[PDB]
Structures are given as C-alpha cells and as structure tokens.
C-alpha cells in the first residue's frame, strides 16, 4: 500500500479539511478536498420537519450561481412552505373570514333584536 | 420478575448508590423514559425532551409539563381551580 498526505498547509482533520480518495490518470491515489454537504430549506410553517422538495440542497453562497427555478417551485408560497401547510393556510384563511361574516350578522341580529 | 427480581430500570446503576436511593429513583426513572399518549392526536408518542418540556412525535406539539411526568398534581388541581375561579367571577 502507498499511503498519502494532506495537500494544504492545514493538517488538522476538521470540518474544513474533509477529504476523499481519487485515482488520477497517473495511477496516483490522491486526496481531493470535498465541499460541506448542503441542506435543503426547511418549511416556514415550523411544524413539518422534512426539508422541502424541488430545491437543490447546497451551501448558501452557491444559491447565487443557480437559476430561479432551481431555488423555488411554482406555487403560492413556493420554495418557502410545504404545501401541506399551504393547503391548510388556504382553507384556514377561508373559515376565519366566513365565521367573521357569521358573527357579523349574528351581531347585526343581536342589535336588530335589542 | 424475569432477568431480575426487584431492580428493573435501575439495574443499570449496579451495586452503587445504596438501596433506598436506587429504589426511590426507580419510580422517577420510569415515569420519564415512559411514552405517554398525546391528548391531541391520541397516539402514544408523548416523550420527554428535556426538563418540563414534552414533545409529541406525530403531531409535532410541544407541551410544558412537569419535570418527569406529563402533569404534576399541583398543576392539575390548579387548572381545575383556575377554571372555577373564572366561572365564579364572570358566570
């Protein structure tokens, strides 16, 4: 076995010097310095644990290179909420208003009676 | 009474700490590593997260309960009394 060495002046295994083996065309196993594993966005509702769908999970300053469609998904609240909490925020924003109409007429009949 | 007679959970503390203390810790060490039934979704998923904070796995509710039981008796007898004090005031 040939054993290998670090390549940059850093020699402490850290979150920074995270490596991997690669076989170059010179038959020379060499260290290749990987990138931190990026995580996909979590929902803004704050209840669903899973990271979203339809978005590239990648380190944040990389989102500058990427395209608009890689970063969102084409819906209401797309790319920030999970669509199980969107379809609730629709039919929750419905009946909050509807039973405000119902109390509006029950209040208009309570003063019409009195 | 299989694998042991009367230590159960606190067998993990071995010969140490004295009997009367290992014994007293037992009832506690049972009621905190116990999984209770959520009173929202009904599913047996209430687990202790840290001191006085209880989380439901399924419905992702977090609840401020007792130190190592879901409900201190002091808090339950207060909840009944606080509820009667506002029905006595406002009716």
């Amino acid at each position: 076995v040939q054993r290998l060495t670090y390549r940059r002046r850093l020699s402490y295994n850290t979150a920074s010097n995270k490596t991997r083996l690669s076989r170059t065309p010179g038959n020379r196993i060499v260290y290749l310095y990987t990138k931190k594993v990026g995580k996909a966005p979590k929902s803004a509702c704050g209840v669903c644990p899973g990271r979203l769908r339809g978005v590239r999970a990648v380190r944040p300053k990389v989102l500058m290179r990427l395209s608009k469609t890689k970063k969102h998904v084409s819906r209401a609240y797309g790319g920030s909420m999970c669509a199980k909490c969107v379809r609730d925020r629709i039919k929750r924003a419905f009946l909050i208003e509807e039973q405000k109409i119902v109390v509006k007429v029950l209040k208009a009949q309570a003063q019409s009676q009195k | 009474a299989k694998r042991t007679k009367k230590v159960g959970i606190v067998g993990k503390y071995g010969t140490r700490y004295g009997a009367s203390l290992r014994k007293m810790v037992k009832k506690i060490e049972i009621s905190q590593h116990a999984k209770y039934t959520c009173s929202f979704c009904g599913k047996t998923k209430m687990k202790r997260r840290a001191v006085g904070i209880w989380h439901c796995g399924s419905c992702m509710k977090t609840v401020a309960g007792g130190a190592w039981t879901y409900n201190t008796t002091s808090a339950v007898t207060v909840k009944s009394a606080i509820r009667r004090l506002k029905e006595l005031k406002d009716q």
């Binding site: 609730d88 039919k91 929750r92 419905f94 009946l95 509807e98 039973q99 | 979704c41 009904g42 599913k43």
Partner: protein, 94 residues
C-alpha cells in the same frame, strides 16, 4: 347517549370511518350524520362542519376522544371522524 345507538349502526347499517372517505360521502351527498369527536384539529372540525352545512347534514360533537369513538364504533383503533350513510333499526338519525 350515543354509545348505544352507534353500536347498533355499525352492526346493521352502513357507515364510513375517517376523512377523505367521509368527506367524499358528503361530496356525493349520500351521508346524513357526521360524528366528529373532540381532539379533531379544530381546522378539520370547522371545515367539515361547514362542508356539511352546505350539503344540509347533521353534525354531532360526540364527547369522545377519537379513541372513545373507535371503542364506541366496535372498532379496535383510532377514528377521529365518521359519517353515517344509512341507519338500520337505529334511530341515530333524528
């Protein structure tokens, strides 16, 4: 109470247990009593309570658990909601 009448419906009549099957029978219109329990997330309560009012169906707030409804429905498990399609001899329907 309704631990007796429901016990008769499951045995003799037709019924649907749950949601997305109950909601599909208020959609069709062939259901005429939706028995919610407490512990149903007040969103699914208020949305069935309204989705049923539009179809002219009685709603019932069984003082249950979503567990003391499955225990009442002769089932061995968790039923939050339920919709009675057809009664047997049970006058669960008023």
């Amino acid at each position: 109470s309704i631990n007796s009448r429901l016990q008769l419906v499951m045995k003799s009549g037709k019924y649907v247990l749950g949601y997305k099957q109950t909601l599909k029978m208020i959609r069709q219109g062939k259901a005429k009593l939706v028995i919610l329990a407490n512990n149903c997330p007040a969103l699914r309560k208020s949305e069935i309570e309204y989705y049923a009012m539009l179809a002219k169906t009685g709603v019932h707030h069984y003082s249950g658990n979503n567990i003391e409804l499955g225990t009442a429905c002769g089932k061995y498990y968790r039923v939050c909601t339920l919709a009675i399609i057809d009664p047997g001899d049970s006058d669960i329907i008023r």
